[PDB]
Amino acid sequence: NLKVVLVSFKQCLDEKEEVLLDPYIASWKGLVRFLNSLGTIFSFISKDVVSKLRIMERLRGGPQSEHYRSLQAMVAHELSNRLVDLERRSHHPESGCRTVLRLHRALHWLQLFLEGLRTSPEDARTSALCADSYNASLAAYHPWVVRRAVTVAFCTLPTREVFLEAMNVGPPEQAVQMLGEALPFIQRVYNVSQKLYAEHSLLDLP
Predict the structure, then answer these.
(1) I need a labelling partner for 138 at 20 to 30 A (CA). Which of 17, 130, 154, 202 fits?
(2) How many domains does the chain have?
(3) Binding residue positions for an N-acylsphingoid base 1-phosphate
(4) Burial letters 48-74, b for 16+ CB under 10 A, else e
(5) Where in the cell is it found?
(6) What are the DSSP calls for the chain, one per residue?
(7) CA–CA separation, 50 and 55 (whole Å)
(8) CATH number of the domain enclosing 92
(9) What is the rounded distance in angstroms from the CA atom of residue 6 to the CA atom of residue 205?
(10) Which residues are annotated as a binding site?
(11) Could you give phi then psi for residue 142, rounded to 5 degrees?
C-alpha cells in the first residue's frame, strides 16, 4: 500500500504552505516501511533515515517542541539561536536543519526514482532506474565507500513489473497510473522545502 504513503504527504503542507515536521516524520516512517520491503540489503540502507527521524522526534518531544512544529519554525529558531553549523562539522552535529537537509535530499532521490519507474519502458531494469536517480540527487553528497555500497544494493532490486506490482494497487500499468496521480503530493513538499533551504543558503550544511 504505497498509495497510502505518497498521499500522506498532503498533510505535510498546511494552509500557510508550511512543511509540518510531524506529518513529515509520519510519512517518512511510511517510506521507510516501503524500503525495508525491498530486501534486507535495502533495510540496511534505511537504517540511517530512521536514526535521523529519531533525532527529529527527540527534538519535537523536548523543551523546544513548539519550535520544531514546522520547518520554517525550525530554521528560524536554530539559525537565530546559532544552533546550526554553517561552516564545517563542529559543535552542532545533530541540529534540526542539517538533519532534515539529509532527509530532504533522500526524499529527492525517491521521488526521482518513482518518477523514473512511471515513465519507464517495459524492458527497463530497476537497478538502472534507481542508479540514474541516485546519480541525480545523492551521488554528489555521498562518500566513495557509501556510493559503491549503495551501487551494490541496487542490483538486489526486483524487476520493473514486480516492483510496480508490489505497490498493492494492482497490475503494473495500474500502478503507473497511481504514481502520476499520487507523485505530485511528495513533489510539492520537496520543492517548498528546497525553496526554504535555498533561501537561507542552507543547501550545503555539513
Answers:
(1) 17
(2) 1
(3) 48, 52, 98, 102, 142
(4) ebeebbebbeebbeeebeebbbbbbbb
(5) Cytoplasm, Cytosol; Golgi apparatus, trans-Golgi network membrane; Cell membrane; Endosome membrane
(6) -HHHHHHTTSTTB-TT--BBHHHHHHHHHHHHHHHHBTBHHHHHHTHHHHHHHHHHHHHHTSTTGGGGSBHHHHHHHHHHTT-S--SSS-S-TT-HHHHHHHHHHHHHHHHHHHHHHHT--TT--HHHHHHHHHHTTTGGGS-HHHHHHHHHHHTTPPPHHHHHHTTSSSSHHHHHHHHHHHTHHHHHHHHHHHHHHHHTT-TT--
(7) 9
(8) 1.10.3520.10
(9) 27
(10) 48, 52, 98, 102, 142
(11) -115, 145
Q: In angstroms, what is the resolution?
A: 3.2
Do 41 and 156 form a contact (C-beta atoms < 8 A)? yes
For residue 166 the three cell numbers come to: 508490489
Nearest to 12 by CA among 169, 199, 203, 184: 184
Closest CA relative to residue 167, chosen from 185, 181, 179, 155: 179
| Exp. method | X-ray
